[PDB]
Structure 1
Amino acid sequence: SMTSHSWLCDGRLLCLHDPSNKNNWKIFRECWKQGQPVLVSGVHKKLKSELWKPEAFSQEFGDQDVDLVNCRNCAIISDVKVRDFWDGFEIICKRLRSEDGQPMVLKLKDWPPGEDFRDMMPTRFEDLMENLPLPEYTKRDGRLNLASRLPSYFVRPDLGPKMYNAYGLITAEDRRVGTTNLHLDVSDAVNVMVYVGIPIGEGAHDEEVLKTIDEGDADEVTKERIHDHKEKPGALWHIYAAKDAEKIRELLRKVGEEQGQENPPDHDPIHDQSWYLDQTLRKRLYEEYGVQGWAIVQFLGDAVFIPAGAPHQVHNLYSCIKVAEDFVSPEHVKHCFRLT
């Protein structure tokens, strides 16, 4: 029946069911003040779906010059046309190929660039901003968003939103690699999955997705969203509490040294954004440091709320279009303060 909310991660993650429900703040407040991430489903049903297709991005902006990253080896592909990315989004045989002759898993880097989203795409901006959940926290002029209200003693976020576009990771070896490596942000963020592209040509890649989710350490209720409701899964997230950041640094310093890296003892492997925590490193983090995270599968229309200071990483299961907005909640303002 109509339910206001449910729990995922064996009770540890709030999942709100109606993104426009004026009472969401009452349940959200409590979980958010404890430094938890939150998931809101059903945002895709609020959007104009014709504005968020790969084909329309290709047609309208195809001639713009961009760089891409090879997600498998971190190689940068320099000064190509953005249509070279979009036209292989879903059709595998159209994708740029590596020396080995295999179609590459690519991320479109920094597009639209800097703070240009609103200028380049005024109709998309309107469609997203008008349908963000928890609007008092997430809108530019929201009463509980301090972004526009803080003095220079605070690190203020850029004007957004930002778009995150990348292919899905495919093989058994791709399971140990990230779309976005482990990092943290000094402000809060909401990340919405506006489109999930399920590719064709090698269109029998269903079972590898399920083994990645399973090995990802995803909860039984999350697996029921696929098998029962036939929802489209986009990305596997791992998020850790802000207060566990330094323990994670201690693990990654030790593993670095083990792997022959020669780093100063105070260097910051989270700020380096060079690590993905695979099943081996997540197990080790649990056993040797007593740190546990949230394994979150972001489906089409799912909004992921990321607390300020929380280390997080992303692994695309299929090809994803994501749009993210920064904000500064009073709950977490400490994380962007320039003193002590």
Structure 2
Amino acid sequence: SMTSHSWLCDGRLLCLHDPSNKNNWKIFRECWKQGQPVLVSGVHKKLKSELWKPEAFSQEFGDQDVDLVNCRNCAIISDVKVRDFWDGFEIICKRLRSEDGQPMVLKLKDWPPGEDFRDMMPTRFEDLMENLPLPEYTKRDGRLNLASRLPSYFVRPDLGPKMYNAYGLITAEDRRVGTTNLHLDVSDAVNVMVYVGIPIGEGAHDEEVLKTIDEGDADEVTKERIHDHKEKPGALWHIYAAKDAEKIRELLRKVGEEQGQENPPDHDPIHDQSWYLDQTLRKRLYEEYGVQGWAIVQFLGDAVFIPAGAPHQVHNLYSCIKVAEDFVSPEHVKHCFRLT
């Protein structure tokens, strides 16, 4: 009952349906050469589901020391146990509370740390790397991944993968906050949604998630994946073409000045990783600068391909475990060159 692919974002986004189809490159490479992001669905069906549960991470690693971020105000919670994060992932009555008694929104910072994923979790590492889509691009030694083949005239990505773990944003005020603020990377990346935790306690929180997707500018086919197929939505992305990055910098310098920030005329608001483009800012970008983006809802098992140089931001709808691998495609190697 499956086709090779379909379109999202009104024809502007390729969606591949079979993550292990040996002919995916033939559809992928034209969209990719044009600087577009790409979605691949179904990767969860390829993985060992018991390796990707929050309860297993808490049991195996719960005594490690970590720092957390309060997503609502960017405050750092220093030197707590990683079980203090995992045990509140889905069960809200266990979640650390603010001084005022609210269940907090928390991101687990840099865990596993640096390049340690493979050493700490060798079985997770194997399960992910063996099941990544477009493997000639995405595997450490794929024929179309230049990462291991480039001289020092190019910025090379760290050894991955990297895990991205954070709770869902909850309230109407939370609609304007990012999980990961607007930034860009000089390498390509593939980001896989390996687990979505839809809570209980303040369970009945479904309604604010629909208003967020709608105001997020999501297309009508993406709204159908909820109501028709009952797939689990993880996170709302906005991605912008690499060619539009300077126009985005101009908007954010004008807004920083309007808000009384005192910045030099050359400072880089995208590198600062301090902005989240809310509905007001995304409309201003379109109307005042002529820039359109891609609004993407990443469901359980969706792999998002983010092109080198493309500004992007992430807003978790529910609690998410994401795992990402950097790579260097020949199509986009210009973005990591250190001259001209």
Q: By the TM > 0.5 criterion, same fold?
A: yes
CA distance in 2, matches of 1:157, 1:133: 19
- Does 2:320 correspond to 1:320? yes
Q: 1:215-239: CA deviations, max 9, x gaps?
A: 0000000000000000000000000
CA positional deviation for 1:103? 1.1
Q: 1:284-324: CA deviations, max 9, x gaps?
A: 00000000000000000000000000000000000000000
CA positional deviation for 1:124? 0.1
- Counterpart of 2:232 in structure 1 is 232
CA distance in 2, matches of 1:94, 1:140: 39
CA positional deviation for 1:156? 0.2
CA positional deviation for 1:338? 0.1
- Counterpart of 2:136 in structure 1 is 136
- Counterpart of 1:305 in structure 2 is 305
CA positional deviation for 1:99? 1.5
Q: 1:176-227: CA deviations, max 9, x gaps?
A: 0000000000000000000000000011011110100000000000000000
Q: 1:13-47: CA deviations, max 9, x gaps?
A: 00000000000000000000000000000000000
**Higher mean displacement: 94-103 or 252-261:** 94-103
- Counterpart of 1:26 in structure 2 is 26
CA positional deviation for 1:98? 1.0
- Does 2:338 correspond to 1:338? yes
CA positional deviation for 1:252? 0.2
Runs of 4+ aligned residues of structure 1 deviating over 3 Å after TM superposition are none
Q: 1:120-158: CA deviations, max 9, x gaps?
A: 000000000000000000000000000000000000000
- Counterpart of 2:250 in structure 1 is 250
CA positional deviation for 1:101? 1.3
CA distance in 1, matches of 2:236, 2:112: 24
CA distance in 2, matches of 1:13, 1:212: 20
Aligned residues: 340
What 5-or-longer segments of structure 2 have no aligned partner? Answer: none
CA positional deviation for 1:93? 1.0
Alignment TM-score, normalising by the size of structure 2: 1.00
Secondary structure class of the residue paired with 2:270: coil
CA distance in 1, matches of 2:48, 2:96: 30
CA positional deviation for 1:61? 0.1
CA distance in 2, matches of 1:72, 1:101: 14
- Counterpart of 2:206 in structure 1 is 206
CA distance in 2, matches of 1:338, 1:108: 32
CA positional deviation for 1:2? 1.8
CA positional deviation for 1:75? 0.3
Secondary structure class of the residue paired with 1:270: helix
- Counterpart of 2:17 in structure 1 is 17
| Pairwise CA RMSD | 0.3
CA distance in 1, matches of 2:261, 2:21: 50
Residue identity (%):
100
Secondary structure class of the residue paired with 2:272: coil
